[PDB]
Design a protein around this ligand. Structure first.
Ligand SMILES: [Ca+2]
Ligand SMILES: [Ca+2]
Ligand SMILES: [Ca+2]
Ligand SMILES: [Ca+2]
Ligand SMILES: [Ca+2]
Lengths: 326, 295, 295, 326, 295
């Protein structure tokens, strides 16, 4: 209760941390608009040593916390009920950072908001500091930013909508530029109040991406993945995720002879059987698996093959007890 | 007729030593060098890209903050102070800075602000010509640190201002032109990104490092006998482009785009070797990351 | 948090022909190239160095004016007009020319103004530019001359405006980057001080020529067989510094500071010959005069 | 905000430290007496391990925080305006110690006040504890002492005044006797209110000391240095400072042949050129330099020479842009 | 400065089938295709002849009615609904359309209206370029029918609107240009009268039918080997002029003026045979009955 002498001074403890409760969502209707407020987390920030890095990976994949109720990577409970509406408006939203490391962890972190959604995620240390809404902060003290709202209603991303910039409240991000260690530091909570209007039949929750050696990116659906998948001719069909959760996939390739997908030795763990067939001109392989984060080498599938023409996947989110013949 | 911007940006990092007294992260203190003026590119880093398109200013309110970066277990004393004329000499011992009328010390694990009083008069922005550079500034800012116990970056300082420009001039750009020879130094031209410190004589000696953050585009020509390639790796700043290079008999021209974090270490940024050298030139611009030389 | 800038500046020169139709000084006319947007470096000159530090703009007033820099003894009507959607394809006849919602036809020796209305909307500037640059602009400006005349310069167009920026970005650069292989249809980034008019195949063909005024700092690499030195003189643009150059075996790098103006005479500005070439790169930026090379 | 359990107890944090502001001085006149109150620092205490030590060096140089408005070693802003008066009186003065190390730094420190000014600075551990005004304290908690004032007016030390004991309010000191490490620990602030009376033409701010093999100490002016300079016959003319700041010096020696002053390899850094001439019977060398602290071996000038008779210096305080031909 | 018209015109007919679920009178539903926008010539039929002379609009109030045409003894369910973005996919079963917030069903022998809410913002009219075509529209309208028991036209739907145009553009016309080859489809240009469905390969196969009402003027060129004459009789639409025609060896050009009612059947409208064909072109304009090719 009493800190030892002297008096009236600044004291630095070993750790400070708020304790949180999982409050329920609460609804409210008003003039045909349904209003819902809730709080959940997004991710936990991890730092490197001696290297600038933003959003837990070095490629940093522009977007990826695109603030929009259809985005599953940021909101984890909102988008499965936001697919019943075609318009929204944020009435209040703030990002809360709460630490979970000791005071002896070093490396000053930051989190910030941009208004558009294709500014290519800065690399210089000085370019981070000059956003209009940010918080410089040490990695052991809580920091919160508000992000300003509008009156304009936007759309809730049911189609491809390639100029995905007029329908977004902005973009959220965070970065670290010192350190330290290679541990978790804290986790970012977001609490928010939204509106919805003009109810709709339920849209899909299934991504369909295509990739040949060319146009990247002829995709549709909610971006569980984005254009980060490597194939040229060689032992090259690499898929890796960044969004957490557990998914149901189905793949189809084309070209010369192939091999089996070697998922072992990387992120994400099997849960079923993954039946596979092919090896002459095309092959199909479906699976179901869970994954956690994360940024690392030797990515999550490394389908080799010999000489390839096209590849295309379908991704959908599903629980545990949906796998194959167990 | 008078614009009025309000912004909060970065200045520089701080680096303490093991129990001495340093002002603005060097010995010998480089008199001036943080004169607060919207064209001084060495302290502001977003402001002077628009102060080149004006001539007069008036700071309506300005404060300097200091946020921590280090662990709470590191000893130190950081201090922030302000003299109202630009070329009174900087102090040399820690006992002197208690006498400044606008000062604020504090431990390196807590935030620290100070205001700096303004006045309702207008000044000029151009500083390449005014000797003396004394009535064209609103003052002079300097920080200092005096304790142990490491050599690590233990924070940085941010400004929070409000300006009033008037009667615009045409934008000449933000490029530098740094010549150098084995002799008189250094005949700069432009803003002050970098710096009257770039070691080169005749031997394996053509060294340039930076001390301001940000991403940059540099071109350079050299002269003399056989020049080796610039091996940029090992020091501060990382390559983002392709680094084209040519020559090696009488001259060698090479462009680069990169970004540096500013904090320093040993083995500086570029470090061309060469064999026997005469002179060198540098043009430094600040530009973003999309404009990289592709491979 | 809304700055407000009022300023007046130049766009481009106007040249006419011996009795034909032409929009914006060429016949291919390259749809949308004078879209009005604060980050359009081909339209504004002083503005986009400020505009690359913000996201949301709003013109509060904008007014175009045409002054004659020509004698009163020559004929050929000029015209100014404005279209609020940014890719209607640039008409061909005289008849549909002078019937927009805002236009002012005039003779080539008289001063001619053009108001253009504003909206109370926030629009983004340009940031990794979209595929329908139509919701982000406040309109599209173009001029046209017909039934001259001669083949000389007969005036230039100035812009008065007033803007409100908001939501400050980090400092994007003002340098651009253009690569050109053989059969290229170039990829670029940053502003647009040039567009895809820079011809090269394998022969004495490595050409680039400007249209926008002002001083410039360029760097350029080439690749292939032996490369001749660039021969600047004979056409547009005047050298101001040293022009260092090296290479001639597989790749040559050269850097220039220069100033150019206005009309293209019938020869491009730099004209490297070479003997066999693969690809060329450029890095254009806008500087002032004293950032030259001093040998 | 809330310390974890239990409740109503004593908690030890990682660090405590006050944050300070550089308040301006403020003047006041009353009945012909000018009254001025101000706060500034003096030094930062550094400790050894396993050895008793007082005022950051082992020789400890009796005096050296002699509390008097002419003393530059303690007050750093006062003496340049206290040279316009011939009498003073302290109305309120306290010494404040504020920590800057972590809790894991050990070695209990102390600071104390004596009333005279030639008590020879104790060496025994027990002799430290029994001063009439002191504070035993750990090196991580703030401790303050007041020091009692009088009504008696004293003089402000414009002359040699060899019995420099009736004109002083006392003597300040501090010491450490355990540890620990070899780091800085904290710094001592002094806040004080003075008076002045009977204004004067401005006296000098220039010390002139002499030294031969004999009478030590035939000096004048403000004691920037004190009798700590070694010369006997041999390669022996050693000068080292303890007061911080930057100075203008001029030296003159006598005797047999000499050598150049080798300032490199110790405390204090060059700033100009130091022209030097001589080498037959006498030699002159001036310089200008800054120094920081400090107590170490191989002192700051080590003028060697061969066989010497006298040496005498002149010291004055001056800013940076006063050096030779740059 | 802003015009304001109020009008009530025709959209299209409705045709039910024997007990299935069809949306907008076809299977596969053709995503979009009734995006409500004054340039969408596929739903309005008097409006876009004046919306080509403007750029912006704002519907101030708009309702859609459905009047009956069939006998009262015919079973059916017609429905009218509206999604507020233009490229959400259309429903595929009758169970889905109960979830739309603005819907109104009814029997095919009674009148049925629905409103559609507006908003006070202005959009653009041009849709040849905006991908995505999503923020330039006020919504998307579609009807559907789900019962028996015939294949007859059982009504039609009418709009009743009020628009506010502003800042006119010059009238380019209303012509189409529909190229086609045995391969990629179809590279339209202009309004959407007709349609990405016109069957032709090489055999007795060059078929074009319409689905919008009105009187029209079409020209067409063909290519390949021997072409037969267009036998227009037997299908929808009646000749009103002379039908001139020429050629039959490498190409054949033919103009026609006619009117079609739109409702469909088998054996489509024109149906040229030919022998072996390469490509075909069509220009379709809407024009009245006095402009017929006389005999
Ligand atoms: Ca939607
Ligand atoms: Ca000027
Ligand atoms: Ca931004
Ligand atoms: Ca005296
Ligand atoms: Ca138009």
């Amino acid at each position: 209760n009493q800190i030892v002498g002297g008096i009236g001074a600044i004291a630095a403890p070993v750790s400070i941390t708020k304790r949180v409760r999982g409050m329920r969502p609460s609804f409210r209707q008003t003039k045909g608009k349904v209003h819902i407020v809730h709080r959940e987390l997004v991710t936990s920030v991890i730092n490197l040593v001696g290297n600038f890095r933003v959003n837990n990976n070095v490629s940093a994949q522009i977007g990826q916390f695109r603030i929009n109720p259809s985005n599953s990577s940021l909101f984890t409970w909102l988008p499965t009920i936001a697919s019943n509406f075609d318009s929204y408006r944020f009435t209040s939203i703030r990002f809360v950072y709460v630490p979970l490391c000791a005071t002896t962890e070093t490396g000053r972190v930051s989190l910030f908001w941009d208004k558009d959604s294709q500014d290519p995620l800065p690399v210089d240390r000085a370019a981070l500091s000059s956003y209009g809404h940010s918080n410089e902060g040490p990695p052991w003290a809580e920091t919160t930013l508000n992000v300003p709202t509008d009156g304009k209603q936007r759309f809730v991303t049911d189609s491809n909508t390639t100029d995905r910039k007029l329908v977004d409240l902005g973009q959220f991000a965070f970065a670290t530029y010192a350190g330290g260690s290679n541990n978790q530091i804290g986790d970012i909570y977001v609490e928010y109040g939204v509106e919805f209007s003009e109810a709709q039949p339920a849209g899909g929750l299934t991504q369909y991406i295509t990739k040949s050696v060319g146009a990247t990116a002829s995709t549709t659906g909610p971006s569980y993945v984005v254009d980060a998948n490597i194939n040229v001719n060689a032992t090259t069909a690499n898929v890796e995720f960044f969004s957490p959760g557990t998914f149901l996939i189905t793949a189809v390739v084309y070209g010369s002879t192939i091999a089996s997908p070697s998922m072992a030795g990387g992120n994400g763990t099997l849960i079923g059987d993954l039946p596979v067939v092919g090896g002459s001109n095309a092959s199909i392989w479906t699976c179901v698996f869970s994954t956690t984060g994360v940024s690392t080498s030797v990515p999550t599938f490394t389908q080799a093959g010999t000489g390839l023409t096209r590849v295309q996947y379908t991704i959908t989110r599903v629980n545990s007890q949906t796998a194959y013949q167990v």
